[PDB]
Amino acid sequence: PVLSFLYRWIYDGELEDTYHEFFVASDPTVKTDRLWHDKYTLRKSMIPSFMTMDQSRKVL
Amino acid sequence: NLNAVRETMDVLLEISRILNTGLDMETLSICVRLCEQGINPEALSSVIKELRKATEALK
Amino acid sequence: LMKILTERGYSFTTTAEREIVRDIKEKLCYVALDFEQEMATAASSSSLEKSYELPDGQVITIGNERFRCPEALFQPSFLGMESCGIHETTFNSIMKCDVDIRKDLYANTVLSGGTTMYPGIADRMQKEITALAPSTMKIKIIAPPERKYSVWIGGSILASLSTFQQMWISKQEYDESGPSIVHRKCF
Amino acid sequence: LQQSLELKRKMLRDKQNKKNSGQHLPIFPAWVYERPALIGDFALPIGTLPLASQESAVVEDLLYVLVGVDGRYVSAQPLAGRQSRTFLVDPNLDLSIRELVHRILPVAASYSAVTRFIEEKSSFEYGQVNHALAAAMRTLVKEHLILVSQLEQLHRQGLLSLQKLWFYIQPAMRTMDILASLATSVDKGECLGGSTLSLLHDRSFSYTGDSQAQELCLYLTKAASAPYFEVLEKWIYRGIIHDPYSEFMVEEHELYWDQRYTIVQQQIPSFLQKMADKILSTGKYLNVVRECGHDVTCPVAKEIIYTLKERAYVEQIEKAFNYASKVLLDFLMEEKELVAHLRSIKRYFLMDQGDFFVHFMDLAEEELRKPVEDITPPRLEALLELALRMSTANTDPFKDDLKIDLMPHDLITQLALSGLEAFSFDYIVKWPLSLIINRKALTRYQMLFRHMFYCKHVERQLCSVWISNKAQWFAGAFTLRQRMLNFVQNIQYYMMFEVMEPTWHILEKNLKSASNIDDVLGHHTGFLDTCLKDCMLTNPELLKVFSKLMSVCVMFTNCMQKFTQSMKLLVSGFEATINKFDKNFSAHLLDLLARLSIYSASVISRLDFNGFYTERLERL
Amino acid sequence: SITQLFDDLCEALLPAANRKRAKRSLKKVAYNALFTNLFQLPARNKILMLSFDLRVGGLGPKADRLEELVEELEAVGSVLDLLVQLAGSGPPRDYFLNNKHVGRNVPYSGYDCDDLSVFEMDVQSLISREECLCHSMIQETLQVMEAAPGTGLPTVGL
C-alpha cells in the first residue's frame, strides 16, 4: 500500500491517500514561486525503515 | 456501380451461408474487398485459420 | 514545381514558399487518370483550383500545374529526365528477369512512394500496369492507398520476430570471423 | 420498510416538471413490493446432544443462514430497525459454539442488507442509473448462490465443518461486505446521477492498498457509467436528449443560450467535473445549428467506457468541442455573416461613413432643430430613406435595419428632450446572431453613437456662424471661435484615430484567432466596454465639463450671436459676451486637462502643441 | 487499404475485454500467417466437386441452388476460391416435406414407404436436441457444485 503511492510520487509527483500514511506532506503555499521553498518537507514519523534517509530525500 | 456490387454481395452472401463457413457478414465484406485488390485467395485461408487460433488462446 | 512555376512567369524565389509548395505537393495535390484528358478538361473551363488559406496570407497553388509535376511516370521528358518513366522502368525490369519467373513476380507487383497521402495515384498506376504486360494474363497488383510508410512497417514487423533471431548476427561470431561476414550471415 | 414509498413519490413528482421529454410517467407496479412473497432474505432440541453432534447440527443450519432463510436449528428474530440482520440460533446451545456462530453471522448480516437493497431499487421512479447500478450488484448475488450450492454438495458428504466454512466464506466477507456498506448510504438520502458514481470513486482509494476490493469498486462504477453514457451519447453528438428521468448533468427545459439547458451540480460524477463546461458547450452549440437545420452529424463516433488512469471518455469531449464550436462558427460567419453584420453596425453607429452623415446632417437639419411634440418620425424615416438612396453608403445588404427611435434621455441615463438630443436609431438584428450580441451590447453601441453625434453637431453649428461673418472690420468673435474650433477638432482626431480605429483592427485580428463563441463574445465585450470608458460616458463622475462645453458652444454660435445681428452686410454689448465666453472657455479647458492628468496624456500633449497653454494658472 | 483491413479483421474475430498492445500483436500474425503459403483447372469446377458431394448424401434441390448462383456469378472469380477453403473449418420442421395430400396436377407415383423412415428422422433429430438441452442443464451446474469454491466465483480466486 505504501509503495503504490511512492510509485506515483516519482512518476506523477502525487500520492493519492486520505489516511496520511506516508512521510510526504503537502503544505498550502501562495503559488508564486515559493512552492520550491515552502511546500514539501518530510513528516518524521512516517518514514519506513526499508528506505534510507538519502532515498527518502531524493524521492522528495 | 454501387448498385451492381451490392447485388454481387447479396449473391455471395447466400453461397457462404449454405456452405456453413466460419465467416460472418462483416468479415465476408472485408474479404471480398480484399480479394478485389488482387490478393491470393489461397493465402487468405492460411492467415484466417492461424489468426483465429491465436485469438482463441487469449480466451 | 519551382521550375515550371518560375518558367511560367510567377514570382517564386524564396525558401518559405518552397516549404509551402512542398507541403502542398505532398498533401493537397490532385492527380487524375491521365494528364492529356485533364489538360483538355482544365483548358475548356477552370475550376480545378481549390484555395489554400493560411493566416500568413501566402496563397500559392494552382490545380493544373501540380498534376503535371509527377507526369514523368508516364512520359519522363516532361521533367526533362533522360531516365525512362515508371511504367517503362518496371517493364524494363520484368523483361530482364527470366521469362519463367516473370509471371510469379508479376503476381505480386508492388506500389510505393510517399505521394500516396492523396489517393488516386493508384488508379492511373493500375491502368499503366494493365498496359505493361502483353495480354496473356490478368493483372495481379497489390495497390493499397496507404503505402507512404511501407519501408517502416516492414522493419517494425521484421526486427520484432523471434524466428528472425536465427538470421540476426551477434558480436561473438563477428569477432571470430571478421566484419565481412555481415555481407553473408545477414542480407 | 416505510421510507421507500416516500422516496418513490418524491422522485416521480420531481421528474415531471423538471424537463420536457415526456410528462406524467407511469407509476411502477407497487404490489410487487407490498407482497412479502417477493422479498429474498428471511424441530429437535440443540441442548441434549453431545458436543460434536452440536457442531454438526450447527454447521448444517449455518449453511442455510448463508442466504436469508432459517434452517432447522436456527430461527429468525425481529429485523427491528437494524441495517444488518443477525440471526437467532435455537436456544439452549452451549457457550463454546455461540462464539463460533457469532464469528459467522456477520456474513449473513452483510447479505441481509444487500437483498433488501436490490429488490427495492429497480423502479422507474428510482431513475435509470439505479437500474444498472443494482444489476452490477445482481451479478454478485449470483456468484454468492454458486458458493452456497457448492457448500451444500460438500456438506452432504461430511466434508464441511466450521473451520472449512470460515475459510471458504472470507473472500465474500470483503465482496459482499462492501455492498452492505454502500447500500446503507446510497439508500439514505436522495442519491441520483453522478453522485452515486462518485461514491463508487471515493471507495477506490480507501481500498487502493487493500487491492482485493478496489477492482470490485472499479467494476461497479464501470457499469453505473453504462446508462449515463447512453444519454451522453445523445448529448455529445446532437444537441437534444430524450431522457425523461433528470438523472443527467444537463437538465432540458422548454424554453437557448442559457435558458433551455441548465446544469444540475450533484448529477456530474467526479471523473467528469473538470470537463463539465465543455459538455454543456458542445450540446448548446449543436442545438442552435439544429434549429437552422443544415447539419448536426459529427464525423468522429466512439463508444464510451470508463477508465481509471486513462482518457477515452474525457478525451472525445475535445473532439466534439472542436466540431460543434467550429461548425457553429462556420455557419455563422459564412451563412448570414456575422463578419459583415458587425461591420455594418460599425458603419453607422461607430461612424465609418462620411458621405452618408454629411448628407444626412443637411437633409434632416430642420426636423432635428424642431423639439419634441413637434418632431415627426415618419418624415425622419422618409428623409433617411432618401439620404441613403442619394449617397453612396448603399454597399451593404443590411442598410434597411436603420429605423427611427427616440431616447427620453440626453445621456443622463449614463451611470421633453429636443430633436437634436432625443435622436436615435434602432438597428434590427436577425435571429441566429441575436444569441451572441444581445440588448446590452446594442445599448452600449448606442450611447457611443449619441456621444459622437454631439461633436459633429456643434461642428456644423460653428461653421454656419463662421460663413455668415465672412463684417470685415469685425474680428472679435473670430478669435474665440478659432480657439473653440481647434479644440473641438482635436477631440475628434484623438477619439477617432486612437480610441476607435486601431482597436477595431485589433478586434478583427482577435476574431480570426477564436474557435469558440465564448472567446469571440469576450473579445467584443472588451472592445465595446473599453472604447466606451475612454470617451465621456462611463465614468465615476461622468466628467460633466464636456456637457457644459457643448452648451456654451451652441449658445455662442446662434443664441447670442444671431450671426452678429446682420452687421456683416450690439453697441459692443456683445463683445463683452465674447470676452466672457473666452474666460469661461479657458476655465473649462483647464479643468478637462487637469482631470485627465489626475486619473491614470496624448490629448494634453498635442492640444498644448508648442506649450500653447501648458501654463495659464495653477490649482490651489 | 490493406494495412487497415488486417486491423479490422482482428477486431471482428475478437470481442473487446488488455486490447491495447494485443491488437498490434495480432496484426503481426496477420502479416506472418499470410506469407506461409506464398513461400511454398477451372475455378467454377471447384464448386461442382462440392455439389457432387451434396447429391451423394441426399438433398438435390440444394445442389441445384449452389450451382444456380455460381453460374450467374460468372458474369469475382477469385472470391469463391477463399470460400471453398473455409468450408470444413466452420462450425460443426414444416408442413411440407414428403407430402402428397396437397397439389393440383400431380402424376401417379404409388406407394414409396422407404422414405417414411426418413420422415421419422426429421422429427427424431429435433426432439433429440431438446433432450440434450436437459442433458446440458444438469451437467453445467453439477460440474460447478462438485468442485471447490473458485470455479464459478472469481473472488474466492483471490
What does this structure look like?
The structure is cut from a larger assembly and holds chains A (60 residues), B (59 residues), C (187 residues), D (620 residues) and E (158 residues). Chain A is built from three helices and two strands; from the N terminus they run αβαβα. Chain A is an alpha+beta fold. Chain B is 75% helix and 0% strand. Chain B contains three helices and no strands. The relative contact order of chain B is 0.09. Chain C is an all-alpha fold. Chain C has a two-stranded parallel ribbon with strand order 1-2. The longest helix of chain C has 12 residues. Chain C is extended, with a radius of gyration of 22 Å. Chain E is built from eight helices and no strands. Chain E starts with a helix and ends in a 13-residue tail after the last helix. At the B-E interface, α1, α2 and α3 of B face α1, α2, α3, α5 and α6 of E. The PDB classes it as cytosolic protein. Keywords: Intermediate, Complex. The entry is titled "Structure of recombinant human gamma-Tubulin Ring Complex (spokes 1-14)". Chain A is Gamma-tubulin complex component 3. Organism of A: Homo sapiens.
By CATH, the architecture of the largest domain in chain C is named Alpha-Beta Complex
Radius of gyration of chain B: 13 Å
User: Which structural class is indicated by helix and strand composition of chain B?
Assistant: mainly alpha
| CATH topology-level name of the largest domain in chain C | Actin, Chain A, domain 4
Order of helices and strands of chain C: HHHHHHEHEHH
- Gyration radius of chain C (Cα, Å) is 22 Å
What can be said about this structure in brief?
The structure is cut from a larger assembly and holds chains A (60 residues), B (59 residues), C (187 residues), D (620 residues) and E (158 residues). Chain A is α+β, with helices and mostly antiparallel strands.
List strands and helices in order, with pairings.
The structure is cut from a larger assembly and holds chains A (60 residues), B (59 residues), C (187 residues), D (620 residues) and E (158 residues).
Chain A: H1 2-9, E1 24-26, H2 35-38, E2 40-42, H3 53-59
Antiparallel strand pairs in A: 1-2
Chain B: H1 2-18, H2 25-35, H3 41-56
Chain C: H1 2-8, H2 15-26, H3 35-44, H4 63-67, H5 86-95, H6 102-106, E1 109-110, H7 121-132, E2 141-142, H8 150-158, H9 171-177
Parallel strand pairs in C: 1-2
Family (chain E): Belongs to the TUBGCP family.
Organism (chain E): Homo sapiens (Human)
Subcellular location (chain E): Cytoplasm, Cytoskeleton, Microtubule organizing center, Centrosome
